[PDB]
Ligand binder design. Structure first.
Ligand SMILES: CCCCCCCC/C=C\CCCCCCCC(=O)OC[C@@H](O)CO
Ligand SMILES: CCCCCCCC/C=C\CCCCCCCC(=O)OC[C@@H](O)CO
Ligand SMILES: CCCCCCCC/C=C\CCCCCCCC(=O)OC[C@@H](O)CO
Ligand SMILES: CCCCCCCC/C=C\CCCCCCCC(=O)OC[C@@H](O)CO
Ligand SMILES: CCCCCCCC/C=C\CCCCCCCC(=O)OC[C@@H](O)CO
Ligand SMILES: CCCCCCCC/C=C\CCCCCCCC(=O)OC[C@@H](O)CO
Ligand SMILES: CCCCCCCC/C=C\CCCCCCCC(=O)OC[C@@H](O)CO
Ligand SMILES: CCCCCCCC/C=C\CCCCCCCC(=O)OC[C@H](O)CO
Ligand SMILES: CCCCCCCC/C=C\CCCCCCCC(=O)OC[C@H](O)CO
Ligand SMILES: CCCCCCCC/C=C\CCCCCCCC(=O)OC[C@H](O)CO
Ligand SMILES: CCCCCCCC/C=C\CCCCCCCC(=O)OC[C@H](O)CO
Ligand SMILES: CCCCCCCC/C=C\CCCCCCCC(=O)OC[C@H](O)CO
Ligand SMILES: CCCCCCCC/C=C\CCCCCCCC(=O)OC[C@H](O)CO
Ligand SMILES: CCCCCCCC/C=C\CCCCCCCC(=O)OC[C@H](O)CO
Ligand code: NA
Length: 475
């Protein structure tokens, strides 16, 4: 498939998974409310949750796919075995350590939590810790499927874990908090089993010979692909340091922002890796293609999400004691983050294009520029300008990183940028004309209308592209 179609499929599958994640969270609130036991569950799943998130955004494939795709036969099998064996040894050590030093682990991941929460989290850790083994294997299978140009089904697999956790939550009336905890572990196992064929179609070897060279690429690419996780941790701690009272606003804005980020900032960047890795001589053609598609996703989503940020925050959060005044500040933080969406999309797409040809140094430089710029801007301006300033600093840091990366690749599809921007402005105009009611659900219709208007006028202004695609099909 084309980068556009594979990226749409990635985003659709991700959306479906995230819908079930929303239902999972709704049921948590229903079956546990605010209880220290749910807090213990969240501590216990923090690290595996983190691993699944970052691997789902390419932190494993960036190093695995370019080395795996360039090998064949016995070599390919021995590479895959080296990676599995190497990480299995590490993961075994980590799980054993967590079983012997649970207080240390929980003190690390559960700092600031109450005593009773930590005591329970130490028990639940015994159930959640082994999940990292199945998350790692899932990520390897995921990478292999991507190498074969398969993106929809891999991106749908988190649905499996969400369903198992939902089931465990339903069963918590009889069994309590251990039930969703076991659901989390079972979910990780079933996610891997659903795509186990990708691994076990290879022959297994008792080797680790390729593991050191793999790690040489894994370290910088992992750090490059987790930069936004770092920015989030930095932002949270700066806001917590400067203004305790604002941390919930930042958390709520960030929590929602994860949706458009996962749908639109890392879709093309996931697809472009295997596209270029399997056709490395056409790096520049595929990169420009991917940059166009990245903009095609991120510019209209930025524009529409900013216009609808207040109705979005209101719908999800304006209940109970969360007033319209809380909605206002939170929506402003969300806007500040959303301004960065196309820049983090471009950063991810260029970084992954470099990874495809095994250039880890240039994106690692960019990652260091982004993360350090964010830290510095957070500290300098966090006190005066509050959580809005902190969120805006994250977006500005992304701009700085993108400027470095664009100067490195020496290319940008300016004409398509202008066409996409115009179509996004036409979309915004129509959304504005439909903005005539305070009804709390209307923004959902407005999102649908926005998508349809954008696609309709995209088809008008990309008519030659469509004409060719249509005739190529008919031929
Ligand atoms: C190659 C380098 C690999 C080195 C690994 C470095 C750090 C590993 C992180 C240590 C953390 C290992 C803890 C195991 C776990 O899954 O705990 C679950 C928690 O969520 C409970 O709260
Ligand atoms: C691989 C899978 C191995 C996992 C099984 C190992 C150990 C099971 C440990 C079970 C730990 C279960 C703790 C549940 C609990 O204490 O609930 C009480 C709360 O509701 C109130 O505090
Ligand atoms: C196929 C999908 C299956 C998904 C299964 C999801 C969740 C499994 C829930 C099993 C939970 C059953 C736990 C039994 C237990 O030991 O309870 C002890 C507690 O009462 C006190 O600590
Ligand atoms: C469903 C899609 C509906 C309308 C799409 C209109 C055409 C959209 C084309 C958007 C720009 C683009 O991505 O250019 C590079 C392409 O080669 C990507 O492969
Ligand atoms: C550079 C392009 C950036 C943005 C263009 C979007 C224009 C849209 C401006 C939206 C107006 C607004 O801020 O409303 C308040 C929010 O809370 C929404 O409810
Ligand atoms: C280079 C990477 C990091 C440099 C960190 C700079 C280290 C210096 C931190 C100074 C600071 O944060 O002061 C805050 C005061 O207002 C106390 O409230
Ligand atoms: C309000 C919008 C009104 C637009 C009115 C007239 C312009 C539409 C017809 C002309 C627009 C087509 C632009 C073009 O050259 O597309 C080729 C494709 C390349 O892939
Ligand atoms: C709703 C639309 C659901 C889209 C399903 C498309 C699909 O199943 O795609 C799998 C195939 O591998 C595509 O190449
Ligand atoms: C709201 C909408 C909810 C949609 C949830 C749909 C399905 C849930 C279970 C789907 C199971 C995940 C697919 C498994 C898979 O990816 O199989 C790939 C195959 O093994 C490659 O060889
Ligand atoms: C995966 C299978 C079992 C998960 C562990 C289930 C064992 C945890 C239950 C321990 C208990 O005493 O309850
Ligand atoms: C389920 C939660 C815990 C799971 C923890 C992981 C489970 C697997 C355990 C150990 C892997 C050991 C793999 C053995 C592979 C070693 C091969 C080897 O050492 O080869 C050396 C060769 O001579 C030169 O390359
Ligand atoms: C390297 C430069 C490190 C950045 C040093 C910033 C420390 C600082 O000056 O923080 C001031 C802040 O505005 C107080 O509210
Ligand atoms: C081009 C016209 C585009 C119209 C959109 C710009 C006007 C606007 O954003 O108005 C905000 C609204 O009044 C409250 O969110
Ligand atoms: C509301 C409904 C909006 C319908 C809009 C467009 C349908 C377009 C159908 C043709 C799909 C165009 C695909 C395309 O242009 O693909 C480029 C890629 O390079 C190919 O390999
Ligand atoms: Na920031």
């Amino acid at each position: 498939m084309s980068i556009l179609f594979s990226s749409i499929l990635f985003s659709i599958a991700t959306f479906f998974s995230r819908i079930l994640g929303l239902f999972r969270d709704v049921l948590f609130a229903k079956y546990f409310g605010v209880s220290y036991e749910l807090d213990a569950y969240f501590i216990a799943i923090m690290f595996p949750f983190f691993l699944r998130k970052v691997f789902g955004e390419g932190a494993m494939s960036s190093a695995f796919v370019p080395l795996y795709s360039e090998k064949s036969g016995e070599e390919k099998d021995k590479f895959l075995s080296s990676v599995i064996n190497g990480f299995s040894l590490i993961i075994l050590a980590l799980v054993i350590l967590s079983y012997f030093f649970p207080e240390l682990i929980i003190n690390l991941f559960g700092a600031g939590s109450s005593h009773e929460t930590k005591i329970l989290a130490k028990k639940l850790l015994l159930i959640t810790s082994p999940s990292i083994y199945f998350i790692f294997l899932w990520a390897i299978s995921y990478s292999i499927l991507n190498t074969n140009n398969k993106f929809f089904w891999p991106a749908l697999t988190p649905s499996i874990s969400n369903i198992t956790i939902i089931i465990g939550t339903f069963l918590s009336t009889k069994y309590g908090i251990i039930s969703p905890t076991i659901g989390f572990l079972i979910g990780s196992i079933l996610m891997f089993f659903s795509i186990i064929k990708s691994i076990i179609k290879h022959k297994y070897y008792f080797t680790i010979k390729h593991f050191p060279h793999f790690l040489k690429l894994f370290f910088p690419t992992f750090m490059t692909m987790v930069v936004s996780q770092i920015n989030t941790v930095v932002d949270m701690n700066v806001v917590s340091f400067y203004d305790k009272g604002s941390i919930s606003y930042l958390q709520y804005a960030s929590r929602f922002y994860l949706l458009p980020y996962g749908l639109f900032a890392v879709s093309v960047s996931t697809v472009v890796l295997s596209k270029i890795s399997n056709d490395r001589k056409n790096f520049n053609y595929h990169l420009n293609d991917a940059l166009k598609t990245t903009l095609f996703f991120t510019i209209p989503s930025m524009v529409g999400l900013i216009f609808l940020s207040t109705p979005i925050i209101r719908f999800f959060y304006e209940h109970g004691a969360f007033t319209s005044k809380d909605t206002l500040i939170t929506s402003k933080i969300l806007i500040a983050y959303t301004l960065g969406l196309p820049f983090y999309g471009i950063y991810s797409t260029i970084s992954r294009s470099y990874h495809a040809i095994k250039n880890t140094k240039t994106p690692f430089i960019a990652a260091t520029i982004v993360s350090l710029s964010n830290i510095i801007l957070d500290i300098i301006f966090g006190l005066k300008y509050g959580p809005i300033g902190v969120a805006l600093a994250t977006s500005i840091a992304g701009i700085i990183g993108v400027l470095y990366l664009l100067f490195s690749v020496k290319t940008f599809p300016i004409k398509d940028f202008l066409k996409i921007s115009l179509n996004s402005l036409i979309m915004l105009f129509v959304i504005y004309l439909t903005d005539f009611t305070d009804n709390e659900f209307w923004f959902l219709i407005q999102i649908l209308i926005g998508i349809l208007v954008y696609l309709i006028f995209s088809s008008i202004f990309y008519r030659d592209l469509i004409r060719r695609f249509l005739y190529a099909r008919k031929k």
